[model samples]
Target: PTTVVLYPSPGMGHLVSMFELAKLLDRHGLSVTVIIVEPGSTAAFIARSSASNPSVSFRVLPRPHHEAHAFDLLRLSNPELRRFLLESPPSALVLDYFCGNALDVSAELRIPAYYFFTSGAGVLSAFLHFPDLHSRTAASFREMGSSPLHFPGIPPLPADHMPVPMLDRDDPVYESFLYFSKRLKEAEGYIINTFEDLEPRAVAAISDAALPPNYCIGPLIQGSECLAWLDAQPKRSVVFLCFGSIGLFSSEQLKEMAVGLERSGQRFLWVVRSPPSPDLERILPEGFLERTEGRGLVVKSWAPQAAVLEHGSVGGFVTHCGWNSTLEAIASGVPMVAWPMYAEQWMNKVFLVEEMKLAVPMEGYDKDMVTAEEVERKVRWLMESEGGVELRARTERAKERAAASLAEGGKSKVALLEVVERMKRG
Candidate 1:
């Protein structure tokens, strides 16, 4: 196996995870070229991270017209990928779940195509089971009314926890979601970003299915740029909150969070998006900044989240339950206050609280709004409760396990070799 190519979806979490995989494969002595759509969107992130590595490079796709829908544009751009595969074929090709259109091309080339699903094994299980799910029901999830959505490897999930796109059966996105699942199953294997011990049943469930082999190589995270700041704070004294790439709090939710942080009396480092208003500094309650001045750090743009979680001062995470973020929290031995907002985030939250018992859930969480009281209670539980202390210890064990599994001959470690061996058929 020489050069391996990967197509990362156009989202922060997807790009971050796939970039890490590209680096890991490079470390294992394989040349990597990631197929990217918007180099401008990812150029900065790539530069700071894996782009510095000698073994990795990129091949970009031309952007379509402004009015063109992204997927439609990608579908139109599909033949270019075919041409690349024909002219400059790789030893193996890895496709993000959204890039399933390239599956048959890999088929024609006789090169193994690996589906890289940047989320958890449970989520992947649900995805592979989509055909069955669609057969069982035609009603929109809102109309399901407290019914449970069941999958092979996981517990019954709340109907509302279904991915937003799958909530309405009539929605075009729901159809696309199912279509994606069917196409994805055609891949030769899966390169999932999760470890076995972390999600045994979910990972194992796929093993029992007709689906191809699943590669569990993950908890891939970037280095911490905020470590020095964290080292200066008191041990387990700060509340760390960041919702991954696309999470945005409603004004009501933001105000309540400000109140909760103030009331909890715990020091905090909150990551916020750049506001449209120049006075985003004043987005908080009046006098809030002055009162909490030295006690908190309000980041207006991006921060090194994995580093923050790995710090001694950061005891809890208030998060949107994005999978990469979830694995990072677990890998760092930090607990979370689940604040799911979109996609399969609610499902992740359910797993964290129920399966892992590593996180506490916020009150009124599933709805668009959760109250200040709910936030305070959950933050307090995550920071100071006896349960929080035990949760903290459990996460440390999980962290140790993640490192061990990544080591020689461990569970996920063995899968990489199997993938490479197959990539070199000639």
Candidate 2:
């Protein structure tokens, strides 16, 4: 069996999806180790949870805070890892985004490197095309004007729609993102949390012979209790609202969301983050709780998001369009209201609402402030409008495809098996 070391970045979504990949590899008769790059209580909790018992050896690499990304800090602790890699190198090293330094380490050690994309394959295609975008649209911030930047397979994107890092040519982050694109081309293989059926055109669109062997091995989520709660509610009665762990909103925006949920009159389950103030009411509208009372369930800080989507009660999602959330909602057959917040979220939003035709797209996202009435209107339309019915039906069909893609002898399953077999043969 091939022994692979998985290095996850310092975010919950990244960790969850990467660990899912680890589990897939383990189930396929491969030995895997996960070296989580985190520290403090967050690290301890993840380490203690199901992550601790992945049926493979688990390791932690806690490093001090550095201004650079997760991989930057990991490099500071590379000394701690180097001795092991030298003494007992694994069959391959699997790494995540922004951790390009880890890829460099693998190259130096002569260990084969694999990239684990926590994002979609369409996004993966774009990352492969980023260098060209950089060279073609090369200019100062003001010079790159209002024209839509276009990619081969992706929708044309306004400058505002691009990631924050990519907006400023002089920003260090832009350079780092560019470096990551270069590192992606350097990797021995690519393992993405997407299915072939979900992104066949995207996976095939890119004309980069430089891109190495790639495989779609995902839609990986953990087991959850959400199904229990859903079984009690009428089918398609609830809307699940969850941004990612780090996703946040200004109190003004949060209030608008609270008011919208209240006015929409839909049974909703909102995962409200702990307000930056003493009282959650500060961020929500006054009497928002009592007004929505039994109509809505507001979970503070956390929930089994993937499980919630799987529940029969969940009819739609008000999502931040984080890639993991998008995939889970797709897998569960629930449609979404796209409210992209950050990073690759905007790109994911376009893919869902426009390219896939599986979502109801909304604006006033991330840094923008959408009014309460607009939110309410969109929510109601997503749940009850004629467009929503067809969208939901399309989602149900997508859910079937997503399930079949992961089942025994399924496309993703077969692709994953081929990955393991390739490793074994080598």
Candidate 3:
């Protein structure tokens, strides 16, 4: 048996995934202690998880004094991280990818470190290649004009299709991202939340000796339930609409989506954030609810997204293409209508539409208005069109591969076995 310490940045998605990894490590006979970088945001979830997963303890760091940008705030925690590890070091230090600066702390303590890349291998491949991309061009990816930026495993990307951070060379986060991309090369290995069958090309591209080995041991995700409404729907009939937690729409766009869903005549489950006025009807198109009665279910704020996706009635997803949402869709065997709103989601959209062939595009997602016509057409196409049948079949196959990767003798399981062996030897 061995011991390991896990450090995750404060984002909800990042923290949840790292805790899931902690559980896996504990199950593999390692004593695990997770250091929470941001204290209060995840209090309830952490409280429940720690109580249930008693073997995996937690060290909740006090909130820092200086509140800056996310990158700066994470960088500020290095000193506290050093103090914790120095007090009692472990066999290895596993870090969330955003915590790249902490690699120095691990180095200083002579602790072997691994980075957990919570995104897909395709994104990881581009991240590892970012420095070279930076060196060749003085302009940001957004300024590259019509020529597509090519990464080894990913499809060629339009300059604007690059991550929002990479689009601006002068943004402070861009500088931090570049610095971390370079620093991450020094890690012992990367523990990625992807499997070979899902990303064969990207996985192969990252396996070169020039880079550290990547351990594919994931699709590790937190569990969930919102199923009573779903039980009444027909099999593969409902189109589930959920954006990530922070994904929101302007009133104009919300009205457009309402009109589209009403016109499409599809059984739908839509999760809309609570409006400022508290009356959800005020923001939506008039009589939209009555028009679509018995055909749609709209929930306020949050839903058990995973549980909804897993339900037999869910046939498709209209998602913001957040990495976690993408993985959940893959795991559920549901296809997508890609509506990328922010962050690296535009890149994820490209991967899904082009490289993976698992989604249909929602035009004008980057613009002010995604018109009702486009929304209606995309929903109908995904739910009933001939192309959707094949896409859904492909998605179901991916789901099988996702499940197999965690089962006996599967590629991801084998990868985790080696990872555990390395931890024990260290």
Candidate 4:
């Protein structure tokens, strides 16, 4: 049996995508092993999840804290892993963009390595050219000065749509980006968590470039329950709201969001992390919960987002613009209200709202400072306005295209099958 080693970043989005890929690969007759290298509560949770899956197995490396200087846990655990890999060297190492030492180790083992970017092709393209990003050049671009900067393949993204916090030259994250970009070119192949129809231009550019063969197979959400829930709701009445895992809104922001939902009067399903700030529940006007009791479900943890979007009732999504969430929304034919929190979310949002014309941006609002009034207005516009109806139609078209791209003999499917074949060649 062919052995494939999968390494995903510790974050929720990355792990979910990696798991989906693992499941897909397993169905294709590959033996899969996922390596978890995060620490603390997050690592424990990951370890537990892996224990429940029989088809896929996992090995936990050293868990490093957030304060660690660099992503060196792989190096620290190399002595033990070297023996394991020597016994069963991976035919292809599927490494996440955030996996620090995996690339070098794969090189040492003379094993083929493929990068699985858990982001839109546009975001990945921007990172590939990050080294060339300069203030003067950035300023010359009209969109960069007024709106978001347009990168190859991705829709225009505001300068603020970056996922990670902006860092100085010496910051470790910045250094990691620089190092990763250089090492990325050495990979045997590349895979993005996206589909061709979603960003055709970017896919074509990568195909023509010197990069390894690339595949766009994504919107990999498992959402049977969510779909059922949506089916039960009134048509185009349910609004799905989630801020990918890292979105932490201050008490003020949470209250504002609640107010917005209340004002919109749309049936909604909102996923909020536990222990919402004191001000969150307190700020809602009296009788708010009672009034919307039967119509809304406020989940305090993760929700099956993909299923919900696919539901017949789900007409709009208020999202953080994470690539996975964005694609899921698109696949479900749900229009969106882009509320980017950090990192490439802003970039993804730009594509959703501007390039694809499937969503609208919630401009001038910070997660911490935005008022309830603004939230209410935007939600209302996305859910009830004429523009939203048109956007919904566009989203449906995107969904159809996405399905085609992943269908049998489609571009993405063909590319993925080719990747598997190449891995088996040696």
For candidate 3, the 10 contiguous residues with the lowest summed lDDT are 62-71
Worst 10 residues of 4 by lDDT: 136-145
* C-alpha RMSD values across all candidates: 2.8, 2.9, 2.3, 3.8
Error of 1 at 267 (Å): 1.5
Q: Pick the candidate with the highest lDDT.
A: 3
Please state the error at residue 11 of candidate 1 in Å.
4.1
| Model 1: worst 10 consecutive residues (lDDT sum) | 64-73
Clash numbers, per candidate: 0, 0, 0, 10
Tens-place lDDT per residue, model 2, 233-313, is 788989888888667777888888888888788888888776444257766788888887668877777788866887778
TM-score of 2: 0.90
Candidate 4 or 1, higher TM-score: 1
lDDT of 3 by residue, 1-426 (tens): 589999887767777888899999899999999888763358887788878988888897766711126567778888888888888889998987778888888888889999999888999988888888889989877677556888998898787887776677877778778888898898999999888898888898889888899999878767223478789889999999998877778787898999899989999999898543325788888888887878898888788998888899998999999988998899889999999987789988888899888888899886778999998999999999989998999998999999999899998999999998998898
- What TM-score, computed on C-alpha atoms, does each candidate reach? 0.91, 0.90, 0.95, 0.86
- Candidate 4 residue 132 Cα shift, in angstroms, is 2.8
lDDT ranking, high to low: 3, 1, 2, 4
Name the regions of candidate 4 deviating beyond 4 angstroms. Answer: 11-13, 40-53, 62-70, 134-150, 155-157, 223-232, 274-280, 366-368
1-426: candidate 1 lDDT, tens digit per residue: 488888876655667768888887887778898877762357777676654775588777777411124456556667877887788888889888877667767788887788888888988887888777788876778788579888888878888788876777886667767777999777788888888888899988999757788888766665243566677789988889898875676555678888988898888898877433314556767888888877777776577886787787987888889887888888777877888887789889888888877777887876657888887887888888898888878888888888888798877787776676666652
